[PDB]
Amino acid sequence: AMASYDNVDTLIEKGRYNTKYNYLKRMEKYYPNAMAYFDKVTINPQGNDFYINNPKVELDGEPSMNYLEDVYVGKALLTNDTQQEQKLKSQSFTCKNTDTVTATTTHTVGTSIQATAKFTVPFNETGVSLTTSYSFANTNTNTNSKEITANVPSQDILVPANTTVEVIAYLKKVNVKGNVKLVGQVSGSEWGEIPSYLAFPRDGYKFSLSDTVNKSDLNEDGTININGKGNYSAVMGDELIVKVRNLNTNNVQEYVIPVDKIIVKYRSLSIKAPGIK
Numbered sequence: 378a379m380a381s382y383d384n385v386d387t388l389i390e391k392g393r394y395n396t397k398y399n400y401l402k403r404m405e406k407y408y409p410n411a412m413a414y415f416d417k418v419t420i421n422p423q424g425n426d427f428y429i430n431n432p433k434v435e436l437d438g439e440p441s442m443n444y445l446e447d448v449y450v451g452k453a454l455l456t457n458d459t460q461q462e463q464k465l466k467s468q469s470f471t472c473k474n475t476d477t478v479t480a481t482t483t484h485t486v487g488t489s490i491q492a493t494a495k496f497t498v499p500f501n502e503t504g505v506s507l508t509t510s511y512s513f514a515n516t517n518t519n520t521n522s523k524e525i526t527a528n529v530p531s532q533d534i535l536v537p538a539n540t541t542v543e544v545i546a547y548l549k550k551v552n553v554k555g556n557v558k559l560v561g562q563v564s565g566s567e568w569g570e571i572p573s574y575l576a577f578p579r580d581g582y583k584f585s586l587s588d589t590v591n592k593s594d595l596n597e598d599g600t601i602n603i604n605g606k607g608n609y610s611a612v613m614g615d616e617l618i619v620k621v622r623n624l625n626t627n628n629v630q631e632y633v634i635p636v637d638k639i640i641v642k643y644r645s646l647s648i649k650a651p652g653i654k
């Protein structure tokens with residue numbers, strides 16, 4: 378069906394209201410002021426099997442993606458005091474970075490029925506999956522993180538004759554933010570009693586959630602669609618960059634150092650400093 382409800386507690390309360398209501402409306406013919414006692418009549422829920430079927434997290438709008446401030450990893454010099462161009466090698470190095478995700482339910486689906494669902498941050502591309510989860514019934518905040526260590530081998534840099542180059546390594550970072558909808562299909566029933574008072578009979582009851590709404594609002598398995606909301610924000614290490622600057626011309630050229638495998642091992646490049654050809 379097309380319809381979807383954002384508060385399961387409202388439905389549960391209607392079912393109870395209806396139960397109390399019909400109990401009194403039946404007596405109305407005998408006692409014309411019976412409805413005026415609506416507040417005095419007790420209803421005692423005893424159990425339920427309310428369940429949220431197939432809870433899942435769905436993106437609600439496209440993620441927004443912003444580059445964050447670059448992480449400065451280090452600086453080095455490579456000096457060619459020779460009359461021709463030379464292949465000079467940088468030192469190998471490591472750097473560490475933590476990928477994070479935080480996720481918060483902003484609008485529950487009502488408190489009465491517990492459910493959780495997994496969320497994988499989208500537009501990942503790091504090769505390390507980052508998952509958390511959402512609670513349907515509480516406004517919780519779930520975090521997760523993964524520490525990544527980069528092993529970057531020596532790089533080969535062609536330096537022109539009589540030139541020192543300065544090399545800077547830095548790590549780009551992306552922030553992926555957005556909203557989600559928490560969806561599922563509620564089934565089940567509450568049971569209990571309006572207890573007997575004086576001459577008034579006990580009414581042992583069982584009401585389903587699908588009975589508290591119009592027949593059009595139901596799916597073909599009898600369930601009702603529910604929806605909550607949440608959001609997320611993940612920080613991901615992205616591209617390892619090396620900028621090489623020619624100290625004679627002060628021109629700077631940019632290179633990406635690609636990943637080799639998986640601890641993340643990077644490739645060893647052969648790169649031209651500015652001033653070569």
Ligand SMILES: CCCCCCCCO[C@@H]1O[C@H](CO)[C@@H](O)[C@H](O)[C@H]1O
Pocket residue numbers: 449450451452453467468469470471472532544545546619
């Ligand atoms: C080819 C690129 C060379 C640029 C010089 C990079 C040297 C960085 O070196 C790294 O610095 C880290 C701090 O950021 C330290 O934690 C590591 O131990 C060290 O290996």
